[model samples]
Target chain A: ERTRRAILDAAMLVLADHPTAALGDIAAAAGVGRSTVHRYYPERTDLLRALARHVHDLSNAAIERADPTSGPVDAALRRVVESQLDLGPIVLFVYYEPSILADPELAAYFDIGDEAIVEVLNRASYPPGWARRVFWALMQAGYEAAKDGMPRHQIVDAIMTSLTSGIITLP
Target chain B: GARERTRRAILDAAMLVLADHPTAALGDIAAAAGVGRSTVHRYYPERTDLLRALARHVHDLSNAAIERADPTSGPVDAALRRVVESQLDLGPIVLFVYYEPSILADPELAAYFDIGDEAIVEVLNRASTERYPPGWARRVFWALMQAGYEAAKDGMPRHQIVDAIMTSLTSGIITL
Candidate 1:
C-alpha cells in the first residue's frame, strides 16, 4: 500500500512538472528503484491506467460536493467550476483517457457528470441539451486559458460567467 | 559561460525557427542558433524540456501583450475580438499549446491556458443574460484559432478565418 501510494504520488508529480518524464524518472521520484516501479506498474500503459482511476475518483468526489440546493444559480456553478479547476491534472488525464481504453471506465463517469451538469443547467434555465457539449467546451476553455498563463481566479471567473450569462464581466 | 550562452542561443533559435515552420528538428534549431547539436543537447537534456520552456515563454509573451493592449473601454465581446486579433503574431505558440499533449506526457501543462480563458470570460460577463455565459464564445475562439492556423499554413488569404470565426460566434451568441 505504501509503495503504491508513493508511485501514484510520483506519477502525479511527473504529470504535473515534466512534459515527458521517463518511467525511470518516476521511480526516482517515488524513492524506489526503477525495477520496483516496473514491478508495480510494469508499463507506461499500466501507470496511466492507475492515474486515470485516481482522476475518476477525484472527479466523482468533486461533482458530488457541488451543492445542488444552493440558491444563487451562478454560485452553484461556481462550486463545480472551482472544483474542476482545482483538479486540473486529473481533469487533463480524464480528458484523454477515453482514447486509450477499448472500454473506457470514465465514459460512464462522464455520462453521470454530464447528467448532473445538465441538471444544474436546467435549473439555471440555460439550453439544457447543450449542457454536455458546453460543459466539455468550457472545460477546454478553462484548461486552455490556464495553459495560456492566466491565474486560477480568472480561469474560474471565466468559466462561471461564460456558462451562466454568455458574458464574463470581471470587475 | 560558453555552454549557457549556447543554450540561450538554441532556445532563441527555437522561437524564431518555429515561428514560420510547422515543426523543426534539433539540428534545425542548432543550426539556426549557430550552435552544434551536442551543445543543444547539453542544455535541454530532453526535447520535452525545450518545448516546455518554449511554451512557458510564449504564454508569458501573450500575457504581456494582453496587459499592454488593455482593451478596457469596449464591451467584453469587442474586447475579446481585439485580443484574438492581437494574438495573430503568436500563432505558432498557439499551435504548440494545442499539439503539446499529443507529443508530451504532462497534463498539468493545461494550467497555462488560464490567460486567454480569463480575458474571454471578462468580456463574457458583460454580455446580456442571453449571452451571459461565455462558453460558446470560448469555443468559437478556439475553433477560430485552430482554423486560422490551418488556413495560414495552407496559404489561404489573411483574415478570412477571423471573419468566419466572427460570423459563427455572432450567430451563436444572438441565436442563443
Candidate 2:
C-alpha cells in the first residue's frame, strides 16, 4: 500500500509540473521501475483516478483540521491556506488535468463539502456561497503566486488579506 | 488568398485543440483543420512560431473585446459586464494562455499582455477617480478578472459570474 501511495504521490508531483509527463518519469520519481508502476496502475487513467481520490481525501482532511468554527475566521482561513500550500502539487495537477475532471467517478471525488465553511462565514454577514468561492480563488491565487517564486509567508499573508479584505496585498 | 485561408483555419483549429489539450500535437491540429501537416509546417515552421501566432490571435481578440466594451465610456459595472460578455467568447483562449507558464515567459507575448494590462488599469482608474498608489488597481483588477474567468470555466452562468466579480470589486473588501 505504501508503494502504491508513493507511486500515486510521485505521479501527482510529476503531473503537477508537467501534466503530460511520461509514465516512465513518474516511475523514476517514485524510485520504482516502470513495471512496478504498471503493476499498481494498469493505465494512466487508473493512476489519475487514484490520485484524484487521494487529493480529495487530503483536502477534506485539511478542511476538517482547520475547524472553521473554532477560531477567528481569518485564522481559520490561514490554516486552510497552509494546508493548501502543503498540497500545492496535488492542487496544480487537478487544476491542469481536464480529462480527470471529465471522468464522473473522479469528478465526484472533488466535491469536498464546503457547507461548514459557508455556514461559518454566513454568520459573519458574508453572502451564502461567497466563502466557498473565495476559498477556491485563494487556493488558485496561492498556487500561482507560489509558482511565481513568492515566499511562503508572503503567500499566506496575501491569501489572508484577499479573503478578508478582498484586496491584493502582495507587491 | 488560399494561403491566408489555410493560415486562419490552422489558427482556429489550434485554439480549439489547445483549449482541450494544451499539449496537443501539431499533426492533430493540422488534421482538425483539414490541412496537411506540411501546410502547417510551411506556415509556422516551428511549434514556437505557431504558439506565438496563437497568442497574437488571442491578443487581437482580447483587444477587440476591450474596444467593444469601451470600459472608459460607461458606468464601471456596466462596462465590466460588457467586458465579461466579450471574455466569455474568448474564454478558452484566455484560459490556455493563462495556464501556460512557458508561453507567459515569452518576451514578445509578455509585452503584448502588458499593453492589455495597462489598458485595463487605465479604465479602472478612470472608473474611480480615487488615487490607487501604483500597481494597486492593476493587481486587484487582475485578481478579480482571473477569478471571474476561472468561474466561467467552472460553469458559472455569465450573469452570476459578473455579479460575483462586481461584488468583490465594490464591496469595500478590495478598496482603492
Candidate 3:
C-alpha cells in the first residue's frame, strides 16, 4: 500500500508537469518498475481517474480552508483563485475529456467549484447588481486564463480590475 | 475474384464513417467493409489521401447545396442560417480543419476554406447592410458556429444556441 501510494503521488506530479506523459515515463519518475506501476494501474484511463480524484479532493480541501469571513472580498477571491489555479490543468483536462466528468463520483465535484465561487461572491459586497454575472464570467474567464498559461496573480488581478470598472459604470 | 469489390467497399464504408467519425481506425473501417485490413491498406495506403478524396467529394456536394440555398428570396441572414444548419453534418470536418491549421497544409484543402470564407463574408456583409463592425460580425459568426458544433457533439437537441446567436446578431443591429 505504501509503495502504491508513492507511485500514484509520483505519477500525479509527472502528469501535472507534462499532460501527455506515457506510462513508462511515469513509472521511471515514480522510482518504480513498470510492472509494479501496471500492477496498480492497469490502464492509462485508470491512472487518469485516480489523478482526477486526488485533484478533486485537494481542491475541496483548499476551499474548506479558506475563511470567507476574514479580510475583504479581494483577499477571499484571491485565495480561491490561487487554489483553483493550482488545480486548473486537472479541471481543464477533465472538463475537456467529458469521459472523466461523466464518472458519477467526479460529477459531484463540478458543483463544488460553483459553490466556492458563490460563497466568495456572497461574502464580498460589490458596487451593485453586477455580482452574479460578473462572478460567473470571472469564474469562467479565470479558468480559461489559467489554461492559457497566465500567472495566477495576473489573472486574478485582471478579473478584479475588470469587475470593479464594469460595476462603476453600472448605474 | 474480390479485388474490385473490395476497393468499392472500402470507399463506400469510408464515406459512411467519415460522415460521423472523422478519426476512425483503418482496421475498424476494413472490418466494416467486410474485407481484410491489408486489402484496405492496399487500396489507399495513406489516410490523408483518402481524406482529401472525401473532402473533394463532400465539398462538391456541399457547394451544390449552398448554391441552391437561394439567399435572395428572404432575408440574407435567414438564408445563411438555413445553409449553416444544413451543413451541420460537416461541422466536425470543418472544426477539425479550423482548430488544427496543419490540416490546411494541403493547398487544395486550404483553398476550399479560402473560397468559402470569402463567400460567407460577402453574404454576411450584404446581410448586415454593412451596419456593424465587420470584425465583430466575423467573431460572432465564428463563436456561434463553434458553439453549434460543440452543442451538437454534446447530444443537445435543437441548435438553440445558433438560433440565439442569430437573434442576437439581428438585434445588435437595433442596438446600433
Candidate 4:
C-alpha cells in the first residue's frame, strides 16, 4: 500500500474511471502541466497497468531459460546473465524502478527469484546477501555498457569476469 | 513574507518526512510543517510538484557538496572520502531522492544525476587497475557508494562509513 506508485493511485484512478481524462487537467491535478506529464511519463492506464506486469512475465521467462538451478553454478550464472542482458533496457528500467517491484505480484517473484539465485551463490559460499548485490550491480553495469554501445558478446563475457574474478586486479 | 516562510517550512518538512517515508502522503508533510493540508496542496498541488521541488532542492545542495569534494583531485581513496563525506552531509532529501526512483524519471533529475554520476566515476576509473575493461569500475564504485550510504543510514559513524567504502572498493567486497 505504501508503494511509490501506490501513492499516485488516486490520480491514476482518475484516469482509470475516466480513461479519457485530459492530460492538461491531469497535470493540473498533479500541480503540473501537460509538458510535465509527457516529460514524466512519455506514455500510460492499461499500459501503465501493463508496464510492471510485462516485466514480470519476461523476467520470469528469462529465469526459466537461464535455469538458475541447473548444471554448474557459474554456467548457470552465465546463462542467466546473458539472458537478462538480452532483456536489456526494460530490465534496466525495472532495475532502477522501485514501484514496479513494490507490486504485490512482482514482489513475490523477486522473493522467490532472489532465493533461487542466492542458493546458487550460497553453494559458492558468498556471504549472505553479497551475491545478489554483486549480481544486480553487474546487471545494471552490463546494461549501462550496452547503452554505451558495447557489443553484446563482450559485455556478456565482461560481466561474468567482473562477478567471478572481481573488476580490479587483486594485489 | 509569511507565504515565503510557510513555503520554506514545507520544504524543510519534506526533507525530514519524505526522507523517512518516500511514499508518504502530502498530508504527512503538511502535518510535519505544522500547516493545513489545503495550504500544503496550495503550495504543491500534487505529489509530483512537491517531489520535484524536493528534487530541485536536493540538486542545488549537491552541486556545492560535489564541488567541495573535488572528485577530480588527489589520490582516489582520499578523494572518495571527501566525496562521500560531502554526500553524507546532504541529509535525508538525498536519501529520499534515491529511494523515490520515480522522482529521477523527472526530466530535470534524470539529466542532473546522469551528469553528476560520471564525475565520480571518472575518479573511480582512475583508481581502477588498468587490467579491467571499460565499465567495470563504474559498477563497483557506484555499488560501493550505495552500500556506504546504507551504512551511514544504519548509524555507522561518518569516518567509519568512509573507510568501509574505500576498503571494499579498493580491496574487495570479499576476496574471491
Candidate 5:
C-alpha cells in the first residue's frame, strides 16, 4: 500500500504541475519505476480515479473535523476553509482541469455535498449560490497565495479576514 | 490612418457586441463599428483570428484602464471605488477574458498580465493594513475582482457590482 500511496501522491504533483504530461513524469516524481506505475494504474483514467478517491476521502474527513453544525456559522466556515486550504492541489487539479472534470463520476467525487455549509450560511441570509460562489472564490484566493509561497497560517488569516471584510482596509 | 482607425473601431465594437452576446456574429461587430461587413473580413480573415485579436485588444484596454484609474492617488475609499468602477467599465472586454481563457496562454500577453496585476496590488495594498502578508493581499484582491466580474455575467449591474465589491473589501460578506 505504501507504493500505492506514493504513486498517488506523485500523480497529484506531476499532473497538477502539468496536467497534459506523460506517465513517465509521474514515475520519476514518485521515485518508482515506470513499470511500477503501469502495474498500479493500467491507464491514465485509473490514476485519475485513484487520485479522486484519495481527495474525496480527505474532503470528507476535512468536513467531519469541521463539524459544520457546531458553534457560530462564521466560525464554522473558517474551519471549513482552513481544512480545504490544507487539502491542497489534489483538490485544485480536480476542480480546474477540464479533461478530468469532463468525467461526470470524477466530478461527482469532488462535489461532495456540503449542504451543511449552505444551511449554516442561510443563518446569515446570504443569497442563493452566494455562499458557494464566495466560499470557493475565497478558497481559491487562499490557495493562490499559498501557490506563491505565502505561509499557510497567513493565507488562512487573510482568507478569514477577506471572507469577513473585502480585501483592503483604508487605514 | 483610416485602416488603423477602422481596425480599432471593429475591435471596440466586438468588445461591446460579443460581450453581451458571447456568440455574436462578425456582422454585429461591423454594424456596431460602422464599417462595411467586408472591411472586417479583410482585417480579420477568419473568426478565430478576430477572437485572438480581441484578446490582445481587450488586454490593452484593460491595462489602459488600470493605468488611468490612478489607484495611486486620492482618498483611500474614493480611490478604491474609482478603480473598481474603472474596471467595471471595461465590462464586456474583461468579461470576454474571464470566459475565454485559451487567449490567456501566450508569454507575450502573459507578461502583459503580470504588469497590470502588479499595478493593481501596489495600489490595493496601500490602503490595506499590514495584518496580512503581501502575497495574501495581492492574490485576494484579484480573487475578489474575479468574483465581482463573474457576478456581472449573472446580470448584476456594473455600478451595483462595483459598490458590492467595495463593501465586501471594506466591510466583508457577513452583516446583520
Candidate 6:
C-alpha cells in the first residue's frame, strides 16, 4: 500500500507538469522500476483512473477537514482554500484532464459535493447558484495562479477576497 | 502587399487550427491556409515564431475589441457587457491562448499582453472606484472575465454567460 501511495503521489507530481508523461518516467520518479508501475496498473487508463480516484479522495478529505458548517462563512471558506492549497498539483491535474469527467466511473469519483458550500452562501444571503459559480471560478483561478507560482497565502487571500468581497480590495 | 496578405491568411488559419487543436502541426496550418508548407516556413521559420506572431495577432484583436466597446464611457456593468461581448467575438482565439501555457511564457508575448492588461486597467479605473481598491479590482475583473470565458467554452450561451458574469460581479454571491 505504501508503494502504491508513493507511485500515485509521484504520478500526480510528474503529471501535473507533463500531462502526457510516460508511465516509465512516473516509475522513475517513484523510485521504482517500470515493471513495478506496470504491476500496480497494467494499462495507462487504469493508472489514470487510479490517479483520478486518488485526487478525488484527497479533495473529499479536504472538504471534510474544512468543516464549513461550523464557523463564520468566510472563515470556513478560508479553511477550505487552505486545505485545497495543499493539493495544488492534484487539482491542476484533474482540472486539465476533462477526459476523466467523461468516463462514468471516473466522473462519479470527481464529485466534490457543494452542499455545505451552498448552505453557507445561503445563510449569508447569497443565491446558491451564484455562490457555486463564484466558488468554482475562485478555485479555478487559484489553481492557475498557483501554477504560475503565486505563493500559497496570496492565492488564499485572493480567492477569499474575491468570494467574500467581490475583488474590490487587494488581498 | 502580396507578402502581407499571405501572412495574414496564414495567421488566420493558425488561429482556426489552434482553436481546435493546441498541438496542431505546421503542415496542417499550411493546409488550412491553402498555402504550401514552405510558404509557412517563409513567414515563420520556426513554430515558436509562428506562435509568437499568433499571440501578437490575438492581442491586437483584443485591444481593438476593447476600443470598440468604449468601456470608459458607460456604466461599469454596461462596460463589462461590451467587454464580454467583444471577448465572445474573439472567444475561440482567447480560449486557445488561455489553454496554451507556452505561448504565455514567450517574453515578447508577455509584453504585448501587459499592454492589453494596462488598457483593461484603464477601463476599470473609469468604470467604478468604490467597489474595490485599484489593484484588487483589476485582479477581480480579470478573474470574472476568465470565468466568463470558461463558461463560454463550456457551451453557455452568449447572453447567459455575460449575465452571469455581471451578476456575480455586482449583486450576486461575491459582493459585500
Q: What's the number of clashes in each of the models?
A: 35, 1, 0, 0, 5, 1
Better of 2 and 6 by TM-score: 2
In the order shown, the candidates' DockQ scores are 0.07, 0.15, 0.06, 0.15, 0.30, 0.24
First chain TM-score, candidate 6: 0.87
Q: Model 3: residues >4 Å from true position, as ranges?
A: A67-72, A97-99, A102-105, A108-113, A119-149, A161-171, B1-176
Candidate with the greatest DockQ versus the true structure: 5
> How many Å off is the CA of A126 in candidate 3?
19
- Each model's lDDT: 0.61, 0.69, 0.57, 0.63, 0.71, 0.71
Q: Ten residues in a row with the worst lDDT in model 6 chain B?
A: B98-107
* Model 5 regions more than 4 Å off: A1-10, A27-61, A72-75, A90-112, A124-128, B1-58, B70-75, B89-110, B126-131
Tens digit of per-residue lDDT, candidate 4, span A1-171 = 233233243244443234335666556655655665565466643334344555556667788778888888777877887887776555545434434443556556654555676677667642235456656766777777776678888888777666555654423
- Stretches off by above 4 angstroms in model 2 are A18-21, A126-131, A168-171, B13-56, B74-82, B102-118, B121-157, B172-176
Taking every candidate in turn, the Cα RMSD to the unseen true structure, in Å, is: 9.3, 4.9, 9.0, 8.4, 6.4, 4.9
Off by over 4 Å in 6: A14-28, A33-53, A70-72, A93-115, A122-130, A144-154, A168-171, B1-7, B17-53, B74-77, B102-112, B131-139, B153-155, B171-176
DockQ of 4: 0.15
Candidate 5 local lDDT, B54-163, one digit each (tens): 87777777678877877778787788788878777776456455423322234554554565567777777787775467666665555567767667777777776776
Per-residue lDDT of candidate 5, residues A120-146 (tens digit): 766764333555666677787776667
- Across all candidates, the chain A TM-score values are 0.79, 0.87, 0.72, 0.63, 0.80, 0.87
Give lDDT tens digits, candidate 2, residues A1-171: 989888988987887766668899999999999999999889987888788888877778887888877877767767777876878755766655545666666666576566676666665653335456665766676776676667768888766655555542211
State the displacement of the C-alpha of residue A1, model 5, in Å, after optimal TM-score superposition. 13
> Positional deviation of B88 in candidate 5, in angstroms?
3.5
Give the Cα error of residue B73 in candidate 5, in Å: 6.1
lDDT per residue (tens digit) for residues B46-136 in model 6: 8768877887888788889988998767467677679768866786666456433432334555666677677766655555444422244
